[PDB]
Design a protein around this ligand. Structure first.
Ligand SMILES: *[C@@H]1O[C@H](CO)[C@@H](O)[C@H](O)[C@H]1NC(C)=O
Lengths: 51, 51, 51
């Protein structure tokens, strides 16, 4: 749909922002911060039961 | 004929080599020193949740 | 009873050698064996373990 499906991803590293998520169906890239934090991104899926 | 066992040949790793001089003596050398000094003592960022 | 099979040439006098057993055996004679006499040759052997 329009807004899509939002998925929260948590990371932990020493670098400020070095990340690149790649998967089938949709590709989403975002920026992170130093340390452990919480981030929310949205992807495009074409199935009700996302497994 | 001089009293000696003759020339000596040494094999090392399957190959026969004819050296110039053969002897066993001492020699000043150095050693490897690893000062780790608590490289990774204790550091982790996590959280707990209930379901 | 002589078991000291060290004619001032073996590498047993080291700190990295470890434990072993000073053994000995017999040898052959001839041009292909190393000498020029029809008599067994004294051949010494030393084994040990490493890490
Ligand atoms: C990482 O972010 C901090 C705070 O925003 C900043 O002080 C630092 O210079 C940044 N480092 C790099 C390599 O961008």
């Amino acid at each position: 749909c329009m807004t899509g499906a939002k998925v929260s991803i948590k990371l932990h590293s020493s670098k400020n922002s070095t990340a690149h998520v790649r998967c089938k169906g949709d590709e989403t890239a975002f920026s992170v911060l130093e340390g452990v934090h919480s981030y929310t991104v949205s992807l495009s899926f074409d199935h009700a039961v996302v497994d | 004929l001089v009293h000696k066992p003759g020339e000596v040949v040494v094999s090392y790793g399957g190959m026969r080599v004819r050296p110039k001089c053969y002897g066993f003596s001492r020699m000043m050398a150095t050693l490897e020193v690893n000062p780790p000094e608590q490289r990774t003592g204790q550091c982790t960022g996590c959280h707990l949740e209930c379901i | 009873s002589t078991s000291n099979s060290f004619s001032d040439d073996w590498a047993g006098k080291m700190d990295r050698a470890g434990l072993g057993f000073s053994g000995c055996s017999d040898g052959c004679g001839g041009a292909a064996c190393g000498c020029f006499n029809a008599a067994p040759s004294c051949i010494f052997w030393r084994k040990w373990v490493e890490n």
